[PDB]
Amino acid sequence: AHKKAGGSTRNGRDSEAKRLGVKRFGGESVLAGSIIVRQRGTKFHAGANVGCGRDHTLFAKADGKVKFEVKGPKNRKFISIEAE
Amino acid sequence: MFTINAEVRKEQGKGASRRLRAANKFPAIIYGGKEAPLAIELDHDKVMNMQAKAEFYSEVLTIVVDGKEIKVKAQDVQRHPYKPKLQHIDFVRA
Amino acid sequence: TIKITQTRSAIGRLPKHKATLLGLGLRRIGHTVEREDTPAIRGMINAVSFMVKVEE
């Protein structure tokens, strides 16, 4: 029923995440990168996470959220190639 | 008023410090409000015996660095581990 | 540019650093080469700074 044995986190296997979409090349508005699911907001390049900063770039495409609270889950403001 | 001789810390490092400590000398820093903080090299033997005399921290020590006094008061003293000696001491202009 | 001259021998030197010098065009002691001052060139000379004597 409950949970016992004063223990912390619960484990299993190896993570199933990747680094798809380095971004500096074309990219249709879709989930750039993969780690955890369910998240929206970013509609372009919005790599911004606590640290030395983050980035992405060039690619004119309406929308394009991130994975979730990970590699810059925050939603910055627009960005395209330079001249789409 | 304890009169002590000293110099200036040019090669600020642990290696250079160990070469001085071996010759009986340790680093120190002096600060005083509007006065610019200064790092100097004090005599080990002299200070060690003077710092033993309680009044050391309450006096207006007359530190003569190279060729001129500064006048300061002792704040705190960092001691050495494995070999009981002076490692670094803080000073405040008075 | 900078003139690089191999002062140290190949014996004892760490690999890769050896490949670096073999890169600059030096494969024997005494040999000298002229490398223009550019980002990479500076990095390599830095890795072989111990084995050679550079100056512009």
């Binding site: 509609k43 925050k74 627009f78 | - | -």
Partner: protein, 113 residues
């Protein structure tokens, strides 16, 4: 990310900011009704008109009714079209339906917005 204080009060709208346009705020006081055409990045007011200013024209009755709310909408919008704005979204933070805010919006469209 966490929900900002403004998001907790849901008075703001991030979905209208993803487009990059302007808003049409409708403030209402038990005495007067205000309307503005503010643009993103702070409180940039391009054009605005108060029901009290409607008196400058020739308003006689009270300024806290529905017919007055529609009069202000036509004024704020008329000045907006004179500014250079065409489209705008309705932003009525906290209010019911068919109220004075709807009369303000219906008035804005009547002008050309």
């Amino acid at each position: 990310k966490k929900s900002a204080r403004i998001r907790r009060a849901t008075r703001a709208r991030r979905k209208l900011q993803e487009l990059g346009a302007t808003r049409l705020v409708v403030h209402r006081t038990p005495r007067h009704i205000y309307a503005q055409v503010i643009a993103p990045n702070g409180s940039e007011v391009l054009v605005a008109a108060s029901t009290v200013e409607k008196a400058i024209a020739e308003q006689l009755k009270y300024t806290g009714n529905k017919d007055a709310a529609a009069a202000v909408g036509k004024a704020v919008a008329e000045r907006a079209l004179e500014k250079g704005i065409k489209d705008v979204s309705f932003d009525r933070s906290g209010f019911q339906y068919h109220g004075r805010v709807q009369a303000l919006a219906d008035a804005a469209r009547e002008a050309g917005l």
